[PDB]
């Protein structure tokens, strides 16, 4: 009763994990073969011979001399009939309602094929990304579990299209965002249909850029078109209306890499002055705050909307100056809650990259997070939790272990390893967290795995302490509540006279120096040593370059032994 399937997928994005997560936990094979040539897609299916391929993220047309012979579906990420490569884009751009997503055959014709599955459900405002990862991945897992029990009944006829609307490519000149003629509603729009590719152009400070992540702004007011104020690297800028925030742009430039704004406009900002909220003020209106923290029943609750969850340096040390802050608060416990999108995702690659000098910038990036795990492990005499609305890799996810409890959204992804960056050895304490929770035998196997894992099977080997809600407020409110009822109880005080012991005493701090050394040693050598292969890894990633190969860790069918 247990498949062998063949994901097509441009990219192992997060919609393509989470289907390996949840087809690979209920006992199915799923090999994946990047999108690299077509030939080598025929090669793939051949070789590997799926009762059933899915394409979860293709930018392509599949080879018809594989759909024609393997049973072949495909993800649309818009409801029945709806086609072209832009569905989601265009809805956001078009205030849609209610959208959906399709499980369709693959045709000779584009989105043409017969209707396997879909769901629908209402839009959000909000960016195209979010979208994504939370309404079209859900859907999209419902549709595929649905069609492989189709699969395997046999009898199954999937549903020829009825009415069906095309929507081209979008064209650069539909997103462009015209300061004087839009509003801030509008902008947001543009954006968020825009985010997280390919971007919203525009003209800033007579620049060409590509905007990403905005946030409405009621305060501050200017003339539409100028920067209106800086804060943590981001830009407020003049709307017909009001102004916007935007944290990332990158360079109108082939191969240029996403960065937080003052980085890209560079000495265009000569003069333009902060505009600081410390994250623990309070205020009245709608603005952009990175880092939010807040207070309640005893709880201290650290918010950080770090855009893709990746942590530059600065930003570790803005984390790492909030929780110094929070350490010194009457509250018995500590709550870092990462943004809904991202708990974390470890060192800003594209903050590395963008440095005069990549190994230098890594090397404060990586002791950076490390100060910030090295905070929180260092906290005798309070509570402290990870909780994960969204999903988590790399650095991000040791960051998470080292609080005293993690907590995950139920749908959370988890990437516990460093090696798919070219045998980066990782750090975060991970030396010292890992073993503790699960011990060396069942940890190195973790970490050899280089596959994403479910926050319930992370759950089920004792990797994290629970999994519980189906949206952010759920998950938050859950967790909010198993966090005041336990530091109400004796348990509590139980617990912190022994961790006051614990993380007090020489030993104790001298083996978690010893962990942190070790690691910072090993990484040492991955930055400045004669292996390269971190750095090359990060140019290709950084710069969206295509792939040349499917490496045999995510394609069973190029590996040495296979029959």
């Given at each position: 009763?247990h498949?062998?399937?063949?994901?097509?997928?441009?990219?192992?994005?997060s919609?393509s994990?989470?289907?390996?997560?949840?087809?690979?936990?209920?006992?199915?094979?799923?090999?994946?073969?990047?999108?690299?040539?077509?030939?080598?897609?025929?090669?793939?299916?051949?070789?590997?011979?799926?009762?059933?391929?899915?394409?979860?993220?293709?930018?392509?047309?599949?080879?018809?001399?594989?759909?024609?012979?393997?049973?072949?579906?495909?993800?649309?990420?818009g409801?029945?009939?709806?086609?072209?490569?832009?569905?989601?884009?265009?809805?956001?751009?078009?205030?849609?309602?209610?959208?959906?997503?399709?499980?369709?055959?693959?045709?000779?014709?584009?989105?043409?094929?017969?209707?396997?599955?879909?769901?629908?459900?209402?839009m959000?405002?909000?960016?195209?990304?979010?979208?994504?990862?939370?309404?079209?991945?859900?859907?999209?897992?419902?549709?595929?579990?649905?069609?492989?029990?189709?699969?395997?009944?046999?009898?199954?006829?999937?549903?020829?299209?009825?009415?069906?609307?095309?929507?081209?490519?979008?064209?650069?000149?539909?997103?462009?965002?015209?300061?004087?003629?839009?509003?801030?509603?509008?902008?947001?729009?543009?954006?968020?249909?825009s985010?997280?590719?390919?971007?919203?152009?525009?003209?800033?400070?007579?620049?060409?850029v590509?905007?990403f992540?905005?946030?409405?702004?009621?305060?501050?007011?200017?003339?539409?078109?100028?920067?209106?104020?800086?804060?943590?690297?981001?830009?407020?800028?003049?709307?017909?209306?009001?102004?916007?925030?935007?944290?990332?742009?990158?360079?109108?430039?082939?191969?240029?890499?996403?960065?937080?704004?003052?980085?890209?406009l560079?000495?265009?900002?000569?003069?333009?002055?902060?505009?600081?909220?410390?994250?623990?003020?309070?205020?009245?209106?709608?603005?952009?705050?990175?880092?939010?923290?807040?207070?309640?029943?005893?709880?201290?609750?650290?918010?950080f909307?770090?855009?893709?969850?990746?942590?530059?340096?600065?930003?570790?040390?803005?984390?790492?100056?909030?929780?110094?802050?929070?350490?010194?608060?009457?509250?018995?416990?500590?709550?870092?809650?990462?943004?809904e999108?991202?708990?974390?995702?470890?060192?800003?690659?594209?903050?590395?990259?963008?440095?005069?000098?990549?190994?230098?910038?890594?090397?404060?990036?990586?002791?950076?997070?490390?100060?910030?795990?090295?905070?929180i492990?260092?906290?005798?005499?309070?509570?402290?939790?990870?909780?994960?609305?969204?999903?988590?890799?790399?650095?991000?996810?040791?960051?998470?272990?080292?609080?005293?409890?993690?907590?995950?959204?139920?749908?959370?992804?988890?990437?516990?390893?460093?090696?798919?960056?070219?045998?980066?050895?990782?750090?975060?304490?991970?030396?010292?967290?890992?073993?503790?929770?699960?011990?060396?035998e069942?940890?190195?196997?973790?970490?050899?795995?280089?596959?994403?894992?479910?926050?319930?099977?992370?759950?089920?080997?004792?990797?994290?302490?629970?999994?519980?809600?189906?949206?952010p407020?759920?998950?938050?409110?859950?967790?909010?509540?198993?966090?005041?009822?336990?530091?109400?109880?004796?348990?509590?005080?139980?617990?912190?006279?022994?961790?006051?012991?614990?993380?007090?005493?020489?030993?104790?701090?001298?083996?978690?120096?010893?962990?942190?050394?070790?690691?910072?040693?090993?990484?040492?050598?991955?930055?400045?040593?004669?292996?390269?292969?971190?750095?090359?890894?990060?140019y290709y990633?950084?710069?969206?370059?295509?792939?040349?190969?499917?490496?045999?860790?995510?394609?069973?069918?190029?590996?040495?032994?296979?029959?």
């Open positions: 009763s498949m062998r399937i063949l994901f097509l997928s441009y990219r192992f994005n919609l994990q989470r289907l390996y997560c949840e087809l690979t936990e209920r006992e199915h094979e799923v090999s994946v073969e990047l999108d690299v040539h077509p030939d080598l897609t025929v090669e793939a299916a051949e070789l590997y011979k799926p009762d059933l391929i899915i394409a979860p993220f293709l930018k392509r047309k599949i080879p018809q001399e594989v759909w024609k012979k393997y049973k072949t579906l495909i993800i649309h990420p409801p029945p009939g709806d086609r072209g490569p832009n569905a989601l884009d265009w809805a956001i751009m078009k205030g849609e309602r209610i959208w959906g997503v399709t499980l369709l055959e693959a045709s000779e014709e584009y989105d043409a094929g017969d209707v396997w599955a879909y769901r629908t459900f209402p959000r405002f909000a960016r195209k990304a979010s979208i994504y990862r939370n309404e079209v991945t859900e859907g999209v897992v419902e549709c595929v579990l649905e069609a492989l029990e189709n699969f395997e009944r046999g009898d199954f006829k999937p549903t020829p299209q009825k009415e069906h609307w095309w929507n081209p490519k979008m064209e650069q000149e539909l997103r462009r965002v015209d300061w004087e003629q839009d509003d801030t509603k509008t902008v947001l729009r543009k954006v968020y249909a985010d997280s590719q390919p971007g919203a152009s525009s003209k800033v400070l007579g620049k060409e590509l905007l992540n905005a946030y409405p702004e009621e305060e501050l007011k200017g003339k539409p078109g100028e920067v209106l104020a800086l804060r943590d690297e981001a830009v407020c800028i003049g709307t017909r209306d009001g102004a916007v925030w935007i944290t990332h742009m990158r360079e109108r430039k082939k191969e240029s890499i996403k960065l937080p704004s003052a980085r890209v560079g000495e265009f900002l000569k003069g333009v002055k902060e505009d600081p909220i410390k994250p623990w003020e309070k205020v009245d209106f709608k603005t952009y705050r990175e880092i939010l923290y807040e207070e309640e029943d005893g709880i201290g609750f650290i918010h909307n770090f855009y893709n969850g990746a942590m530059s340096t600065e930003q570790c040390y803005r984390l790492l100056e909030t929780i110094k802050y929070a350490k010194k608060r009457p509250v018995k416990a500590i709550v870092l809650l990462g943004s999108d991202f708990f974390s995702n470890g060192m800003n690659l594209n903050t590395i990259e963008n440095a005069e000098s990549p190994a230098d910038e890594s090397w404060r990036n990586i002791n950076a997070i490390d100060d910030v795990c090295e905070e492990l260092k906290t005798p005499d309070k509570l402290t939790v990870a909780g994960m609305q969204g999903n988590a890799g790399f650095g991000g996810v040791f960051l998470a272990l080292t609080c005293d409890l993690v907590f995950a959204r139920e749908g959370v992804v988890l990437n516990p390893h460093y090696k798919n960056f070219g045998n980066l050895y990782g750090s975060e304490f991970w030396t010292y967290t890992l073993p503790k929770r699960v011990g060396w069942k940890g190195k196997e973790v970490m050899e795995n280089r596959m994403p894992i479910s926050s319930k099977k992370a759950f089920e080997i004792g990797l994290i302490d629970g999994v519980f809600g189906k949206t407020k759920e998950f938050r409110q859950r967790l909010k509540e198993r966090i005041k009822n336990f530091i109400n109880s004796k348990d509590f005080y139980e617990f912190i006279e022994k961790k006051k012991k614990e993380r007090t005493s020489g030993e104790w701090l001298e083996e978690i120096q010893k962990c942190r050394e070790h690691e910072l040693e090993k990484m040492k050598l991955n930055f400045y040593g004669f292996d390269t292969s971190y750095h090359i890894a990060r990633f950084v710069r969206r370059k295509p792939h040349f190969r499917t490496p045999p860790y995510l394609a069973i069918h190029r590996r040495l032994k296979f029959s």
